[PDB]
Design a protein around this ligand. Structure first.
Ligand SMILES: Nc1ncnc2c1ncn2[C@@H]1O[C@H](COP(=O)(O)OP(=O)(O)O)[C@@H](O)[C@H]1O
Lengths: 97, 85, 444, 109, 96, 96, 80, 109, 96
DNA sequence: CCTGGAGAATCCCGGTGCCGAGGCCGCTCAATTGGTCGTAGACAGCTCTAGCACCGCTTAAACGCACGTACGCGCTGTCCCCCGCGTTTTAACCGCCAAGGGGATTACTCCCTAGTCTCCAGGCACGTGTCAGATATATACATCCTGTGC
DNA sequence: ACAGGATGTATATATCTGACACGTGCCTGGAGACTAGGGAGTAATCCCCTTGGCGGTTAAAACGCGGGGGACAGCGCGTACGTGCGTTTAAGCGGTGCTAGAGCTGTCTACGACCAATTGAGCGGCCTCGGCACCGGGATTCTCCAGG
């Protein structure tokens, strides 16, 4: 009875919205916790400047977005609409991981 | 003597966040196993960058990681980042 | 020159020998055109004085313009009840709730302007800066004036940016750490008199500068009851494992970022650390009181409390210490309840009522030092223990007197544990320095 | 007397600090000696590149109905251009977002 | 007070005013432009130093800068930049 | 008669060429191609033998890597035959 | 000169593909691969010609080719 | 009078030329000054890397029934070791060939 | 006899004779090893120069070289190389 | 679904040529001494940022759930396309010879650049105020989805 | 196939705020003038390496043919995912409280690297030989493919 959108319209609207926006998508505090946990095993008792975490987050977003673009291209190459770990691993091996 | 744990920090990044990233990348439909793979990829990338940055900071004889160290690490990897000095 | 008793427009408000003088001082300050600070501390009718001041302005003067009273959230209902019950004629409105409710309130009452007094919390004030600045305010009342004790803060700058004619500060202890904060309060009060950062060189000049805009009174001057309280300072030595961890943290694999706070959760109980606890099993036996000096003394001292009048109120600084004492009490199977900031708001009042029931079998009541609602009538306690001391002697005093309510009949005796020759002594030394400064500045 | 000093930038008709470029070249440990015309050449090249990118960014800003240039406008200008996208291929611009790009297979039909 | 920090903000603003009189720029955009100028300067100077070492010279000259520009920039940009640099050096050498 | 199945000869060739190491493009045609390409940028150009050999080595290595990536893309598409679309996908992902 | 790209023959493309590790080859691969070779060679040769023009020479050297390859990220060992 | 000359290579026990490394470092224009121990450190690192690659290549050549190291052996040694392959991933070795590798799908059923 | 040219040929031969007493090398292999040594030296020296510039110092020292090798060489190679270099510098300091 | 045939690849011997390995000559770069000067190590005071243990509110965003639907995936049939082989033609490959440009070296000379001192004027840190860009509401418009009728 | 009904989205308008653009004051690095030295341009010489040509040979390519296998389109299905909704929570903001770690200007000082001249031995170039790699040949083993 209630009006419903098809499986794929809201996805396209979200794609348009997020390709139009420029902000960051991962949450700041979880990202900082992850960064500190990773840095701790390399060296203990580290202090991070608030600018360094932002730079790391920007680089992480850019890398993930480019990877997802290439993964989508591979999935379309395989005549599919979904992206899969096969596609991600293929894209990484082509890029030269 | 009390105990309580929350979660792992690799799970701190969430499936809706990964979906937002994929939408910005242009992906329409996503499989359910993409999320563990994405967490692995992000962890590897971060470990490389953090290793380089910590090496720079250790050479500087400092205890504080700086944006300049991060930028130098990214430039050495080949991912020149503008807007952070 | 002013009335010495309760005015007519306050119904069933008696103004017993302190509200009258306070109201006369407030009226005199308005006539002289200088803002004031009312610092009689918890125990006197500060709310009644402010309400009666507003009633005086509304009735004897014809200036019932835009009035704002800033209060914390927990006191909103109390202030509204006082407004509606003691000066019913001064009809007032309040702002509280989510964004849509704020829009409803502003569209229904605030913008139509039929309101006279608006009562709001700090957060709602910050959220409604642009929707509140449009009204030419006449009086600006800030209960718990020590909230704005620090400059360079959002609330302080926002309240400075408001267009107001006068203002009035309510606080218990205006001076906490140094004269910089009291200067901040005075600079907010008088916008231009105290713009600078600047026994006869001190004390005297401070008193004769602070006289024109401050009041300080004592309940016992006329109340003459509520027998005094004795503070027992118990020095306690640490255990061998405590000494070991003390040395390991002091010399420098765990995280050692803030050395002072690391030594803190270590002079209290090493089981707040990691690795002090035994192996994979969590065996709650002798991995307890018998491994920390403070806990040993506590286990020695509690049975005497059981054998005597009892009802030990416990004040701590760390919820981790609260949890470990909870484990100790369940190991000893003692009647207890735990209250802190993490406790849901509704879950706190029923706990207080249960502990204050005429027949309360509960023996241990744990509260954090600052995690109270600035109220908490714990008039049924008889023993108060300060397991830890903070850097705020004023906060310690307020936690002490929150159990010193009028209802109290048995004199409450305070305990203070100190680990001698450790960082606790430093903490107490800084606290004593601050307390002496605050006393010599304000109390006289 | 002493002739009034004329900056080498205005002497060569530039807007970039020729003297500062010479100092940076000499302190940069690139070579032992630096010619007189090398900093002038380099400053002119830098000015041309900066002017091109700023003009493209300003066109994008005017198209987006804002009179200020932001990093998103810079990213739009750097992409949408073959030469600039090749020069800045491996460069990440903070707060730049991505170009609108939807594959035609995904579009409904 | 503070330690002096040097950048290219003044010159970037002047070039922006020349190419678009009624147009502003944000602080982060200025940081991006500063980093861009620094990156291009470093690339061209490194190419010139490598050329000087390869040819067993010791002086970085206008010929080396031009060759480095042609190696770095992609084509039409390279030729336009070469024209700009030739005009600049000729104007600087003509009577000064 | 005698005839092999369609695909064993290819596998033997694969093994033979992955075991060998010598060049696989005719030297004189490659040299003529190089000279024809070099005619555009400058006339009356001369080459050394080592230059042509190095160019051939680099070109062959580039082509071999591209073909490996193309074979991977074809396998990903659940195919055995490689296609120009696979070549284009490999180029696009690698960044050209 | 002209018609020299066709000197790159189908059997040579097949041998290179087999060394790559492919089994079946489409008929349309060959002209695409020729175009790829043309663009790669043009880039490398252009950079080498820039180096030899700076050197004020008329003969292209293996060192010039190696310098071009290195600046394009395709370092070649074994020629100087 | 002077004592007999002792090379810094013999002082540090190395086989690579410390003096030549120092001269190249001074003349290569990497910094204004060079410490005494930097050439020694660099020569030791170069010697270690050469020893590793040469032992890998020699073992591979012995497995091939030959006593001469050739570019094929060098390529096999480099590409069969993960760390060296990462170090020389973007490097082409003349007359090296490729690693024998056939995808399992192409193998006959 | 033209102008003399230097290389690491004799040193590579000595290292080869140390590690494998009964193995020889060819001219192409020697050229490959010489180019490899030059490339590694260039990379390490450039990274050390950048480190010195970042830290605003005017010297290249053992700390700069060690940090450069830890940045360039991955993992186990870095640890072994650092150990070798530290041993060599210790023997040089003790023998001086 | 095993047999046996026919190609391909592997292994062992013997002969050739040449390139690697060694032995000398001569010089050019590295080692040894002595002197100095500045760069870096070490201290000191100010001031500013980060962290750790919390508290108090607020609310957007994450989390778990139900449900129907495109979608991924397996199986089939068709067809033509690519492969494998034999034939003929073509051009690479090899070796050899001749000619001349052009890279490479040496000797002169000058002009261009390092280095210094002096002066001053451009560029940087610091305040300060006003406009461009969020943000919030109420319209108006385009998109999509299903039921309705044909 | 086409209407209308709900939903998101764009546009106009008004408001507010904080960051950007400009002016001030002061200092430090760039410009003017000078000197001195050697780096690089310029001319001449040599000789090596490139180019051009020819002729015989043989592998390699081009071409045609025949046929089995892979590509591609179609069909069915059952399942993992996208969409909407209620519930929980953890992020984000605003606060305390203190202490260290590094950027700082200022300062001192000492030792380590640059520099110079001498001198000798290590390293490159050159010349010569023997064994290792290569190639051809013959016997042995392996793998694939058709038939019954
Ligand atoms: N009706 C009253 N008039 C004056 N003082 C009172 C009255 N009731 C209680 N008090 C005193 O006030 C104290 C509690 O009031 P309190 O919460 O301190 O008010 P406030 O928060 O305004 O200071 C008690 O100790 C009691 O002695």
């Amino acid at each position: 009875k209630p009006h419903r959108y098809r499986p794929g319209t809201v996805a396209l609207r979200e794609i348009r919205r997020y390709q139009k926006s420029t902000e960051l998508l991962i949450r700041k505090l979880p990202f900082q916790r992850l960064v500190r946990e990773i840095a701790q095993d390399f060296k203990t008792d580290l202090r991070f400047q608030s600018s360094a975490v932002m730079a790391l987050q920007e680089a992480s977003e850019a890398y993930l977005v480019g990877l997802f673009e290439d993964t989508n291209l591979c999935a379309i190459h395989a005549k599919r609409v979904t992206i899969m770990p096969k596609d991600i691993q293929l894209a990484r091996r082509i890029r030269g991981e | 003597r009390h105990r309580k744990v929350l979660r792992d920090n690799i799970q701190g990044i969430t499936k809706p966040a990964i979906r937002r990233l994929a939408r910005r990348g242009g992906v329409k439909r996503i499989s359910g196993l993409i999320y563990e793979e994405t967490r692995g990829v992000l962890k590897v990338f971060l470990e490389n960058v953090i290793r380089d940055a910590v090496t720079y900071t250790e050479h500087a004889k400092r205890k504080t990681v700086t944006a300049m160290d991060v930028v130098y690490a990214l430039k050495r990897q080949g991912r020149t980042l503008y807007g952070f000095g | 020159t002013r009335f010495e008793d309760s005015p007519s427009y306050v119904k069933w408000g008696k103004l017993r020998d302190y509200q009258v003088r306070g109201l006369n001082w407030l009226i005199s300050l308005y006539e002289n055109g200088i803002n004031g600070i009312l610092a009689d501390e918890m125990g006197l009718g500060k709310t009644l004085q402010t309400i009666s001041l507003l009633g005086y302005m509304k009735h004897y003067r014809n200036i019932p313009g835009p009035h704002m009273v800033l209060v914390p959230k927990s006191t909103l209902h109390n202030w509204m009840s006082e407004f509606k019950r003691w000066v019913p004629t001064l009809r007032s409105v309040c702002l509280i709730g989510d964004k849509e409710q704020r829009a409803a309130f502003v569209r229904d009452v605030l913008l139509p302007g039929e309101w006279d007094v608006c009562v709001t919390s700090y957060e709602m004030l910050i959220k409604e800066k642009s929707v509140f600045k449009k009204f030419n305010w006449r009086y600006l009342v800030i209960d718990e004036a020590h909230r704005i004790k620090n400059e360079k803060s959002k609330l302080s700058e926002i309240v400075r940016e408001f267009k107001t004619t006068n203002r009035l500060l309510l606080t218990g202890t205006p001076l906490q750490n140094n004269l910089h904060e009291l200067w901040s309060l005075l600079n907010f009060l008088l916008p231009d008199v105290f713009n600078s950062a600047d026994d006869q060189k001190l004390v005297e000049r401070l008193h004769m500068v602070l006289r024109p805009f401050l009041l300080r009174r004592i309940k016992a001057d006329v109340e003459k009851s509520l027998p005094p309280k004795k503070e027992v300072k118990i020095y306690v030595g640490l255990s061998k494992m405590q000494r070991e961890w003390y040395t390991r943290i002091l010399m420098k694999k765990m995280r050692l970022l803030n050395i002072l706070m690391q030594l803190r959760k270590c002079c209290n109980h090493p089981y707040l650390f990691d690795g002090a606890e035994p192996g994979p099993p969590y065996t709650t036996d002798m991995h307890l009181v018998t491994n920390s000096g403070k806990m040993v003394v506590l286990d020695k001292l509690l049975p005497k409390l059981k054998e005597q009048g009892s009802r030990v109120l416990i004040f701590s600084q760390m919820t981790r210490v609260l949890d470990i004492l909870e484990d100790y009490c369940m190991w000893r199977n003692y009647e207890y309840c735990r209250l802190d900031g993490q406790t849901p708001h509704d879950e706190r009042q029923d706990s207080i009522n249960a502990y204050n029931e005429p027949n309360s079998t509960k023996f241990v009541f744990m509260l954090s030092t600052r995690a109270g609602g600035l109220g908490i009538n714990l008039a049924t306690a008889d023993v108060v223990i300060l397991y830890d001391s903070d850097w705020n002697p004023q906060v310690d005093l307020q936690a002490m007197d929150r159990a010193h309510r009028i209802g109290q009949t048995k004199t409450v005796r305070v305990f203070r544990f100190i680990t001698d020759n450790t960082v606790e002594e430093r903490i107490v030394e800084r606290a004593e320095m601050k307390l002496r400064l605050d006393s010599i500045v304000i109390q006289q | 007397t002493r002739a009034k000093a004329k900056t080498r930038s205005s002497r060569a008709g530039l807007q970039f600090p020729v003297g500062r470029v010479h100092r940076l070249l000499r302190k940069g440990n690139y070579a032992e000696r630096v010619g007189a015309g090398a900093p002038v050449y380099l400053a002119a090249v830098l000015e041309y590149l900066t002017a091109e990118i700023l003009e493209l960014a300003g066109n994008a800003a005017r198209d987006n109905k804002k009179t200020r240039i932001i990093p998103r406008h810079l990213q739009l200008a750097v992409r949408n251009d073959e030469e600039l996208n090749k020069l800045l291929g491996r460069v990440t611009i903070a707060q730049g977002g991505v170009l609108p790009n939807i594959q035609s297979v995904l579009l409904p039909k | 007070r503070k330690t002096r920090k040097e950048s290219y903000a003044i010159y970037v603003y002047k070039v922006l005013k020349q190419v678009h009189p009624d147009t502003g720029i944000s602080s982060k955009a200025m940081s991006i432009m500063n980093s861009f100028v620094n990156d291009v300067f470093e690339r061209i100077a490194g190419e010139a130093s490598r050329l000087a070492h390869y040819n067993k010279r010791s002086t970085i000259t206008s010929r080396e800068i031009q060759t480095a520009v042609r190696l770095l920039l992609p084509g039409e940009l390279a030729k336009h930049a070469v024209s700009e640099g030739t005009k600049a050096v000729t104007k600087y050498t003509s009577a000064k």
